[PDB]
Amino acid sequence: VSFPASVQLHTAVEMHHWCIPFSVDGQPAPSLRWLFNGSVLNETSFIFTEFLEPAANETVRHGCLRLNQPTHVNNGNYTLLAANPFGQASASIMAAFMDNPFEFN
Secondary structure, eight states: OOOOOOOOOOOOOOOOEEEEEEOOOOSOOEEEEEEEEEEEEOOSEEEEEEEOOOOSSOOOOOEEEEEOOGGGGEEEEEEEEEEEEEEEEEEEEEEEESOOOOOOO
């Protein structure tokens, strides 16, 4: 069972944590939904919505659709849809996180 403490460090590396910045306003507070290339994007533990802190001033809410482990499969068009009783809005953005994989001939 019992033995001495051992430890090991490696070369520091930058992760590929990305953020698609967004702002959302409306009262009552709207609901959000994302689309990836036109279809519902279901949030996982590696792709999820995250809000920044509320200013104390405005009604807006700022945040990120965070992507912690993106690869070329995640390259595409992203849309955020918001809706409240008084109206519905949408905004598109194209994003690329990694080049497309090399293919031989």
